[PDB]
Amino acid sequence: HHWGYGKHNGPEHWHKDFPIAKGERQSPVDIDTHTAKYDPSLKPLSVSYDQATSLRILNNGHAFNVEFDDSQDKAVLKGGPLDGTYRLIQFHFHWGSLDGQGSEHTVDKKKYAAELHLVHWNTKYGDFGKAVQQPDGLAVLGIFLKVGSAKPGLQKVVDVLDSIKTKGKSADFTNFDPRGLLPESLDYWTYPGSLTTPPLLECVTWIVLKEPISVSSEQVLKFRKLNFNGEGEPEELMVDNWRPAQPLKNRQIKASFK
Numbered sequence: 081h082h083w084g085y086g087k088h089n090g091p092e093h094w095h096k097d098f099p100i101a102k103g104e105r106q107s108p109v110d111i112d113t114h115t116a117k118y119d120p121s122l123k124p125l126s127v128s129y130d131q132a133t134s135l136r137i138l139n140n141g142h143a144f145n146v147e148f149d150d151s152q153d154k155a156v157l158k159g160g161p162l163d164g165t166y167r168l169i170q171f172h173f174h175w176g177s178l179d180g181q182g183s184e185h186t187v188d189k190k191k192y193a194a195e196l197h198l199v200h201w202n203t204k205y206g207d208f209g210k211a212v213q214q215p216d217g218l219a220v221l222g223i224f225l226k227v228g229s230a231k232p233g234l235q236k237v238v239d240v241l242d243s244i245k246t247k248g249k250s251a252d253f254t255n256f257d258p259r260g261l262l263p264e265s266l267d268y269w270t271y272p273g274s275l276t277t278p279p280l281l282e283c284v285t286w287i288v289l290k291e292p293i294s295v296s297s298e299q300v301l302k303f304r305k306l307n308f309n310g311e312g313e314p315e316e317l318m319v320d321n322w323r324p325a326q327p328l329k330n331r332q333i334k335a336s337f338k
């Protein structure tokens with residue numbers, strides 16, 4: 081009876097094994113655009129992905145992760161609200177069964193079709209497992225997806241999904257350039273929060289870009305043909321793998337832009 085996104089093991093149940101689910105800095109949240117304050121002391125984000133080394137793509141039973149070599153400073157996030165250097169370890173998405181839902185963050189209660197999370201860890205803690213025990217251990221860059229025109233830089237991901245349909249399957253995924261997933265503008269909102277899946281640790285600086293990327297209906301349909309189940313188990317489509325918005329509590333969301 082492991083956690084997931086079903087009726088019996090979904091987000092409303094997670095607090096029974098992970099009591100931090102009801103904590104003071106949980107993610108995701110609704111971003112109220114009228115309440116977020118412009119912070120002129122924030123810096124432009126520095127997204128340095130030109131030396132990124134992708135390795136593998138894995139269906140882990142709740143999403144698919146594209147994994148990177150983080151054994152040196154190759155793909156890093158710096159600046160904005162961050163102190164020091166955060167290394168890219170993996171990206172993954174959260175998506176819906178229909179285009180009207182799927183994102184984890186919301187914007188004035190608007191749900192997007194999906195949400196990309198680029199996950200980075202603070203190199204002053206030495207490894208990812210040490211970084212998730214610290215309040216400034218991770219930085220997650222969140223990017224909304226809307227359905228419209230295809231995203232050319234997503235198609236290499238879309239075309240490998242048939243090879244990792246079920247839980248525990250992986251495939252080589254070298255020479256993927258994550259710069260092809262970025263929007264034009266790096267304007268963002270930022271707040272302190274958490275991992276959005278168990279163990280829900282309160283270790284994340286969230287950086288959520290204002291500008292969504294556009295993907296095609298055919299691209300998101302391929303995400304929705306993945307399975308939560310293992311091979312030779314009853315088929316359960318991998319859809320609606322998103323946590324809903326959590327209470328903001330004693331937090332302020334800051335905007336990088338006027």
Ligand SMILES: CC1(C)O[C@H]2[C@H](O)CN(CCCCCCn3cc(CNC(=O)c4ccc(S(N)(=O)=O)cc4)nn3)C[C@@H]2O1
Nearest residue numbers: 147169170197199208209212220274275276277278279284
């Ligand atoms: C195994 C590998 C290559 O994959 C990276 C994955 O992000 C996580 N691996 C397992 C870490 C082992 C103990 C550390 C604590 N921890 C981490 C995890 C896995 N969860 C997570 O790492 C996680 C990351 C991001 C997010 S979100 N949706 O962006 O907020 C949510 C969760 N489970 N327990 C470390 C990884 O290195």
Ligand SMILES: [Zn+2]
Nearest residue numbers: 173174197276
């Ligand atoms: Zn995520």
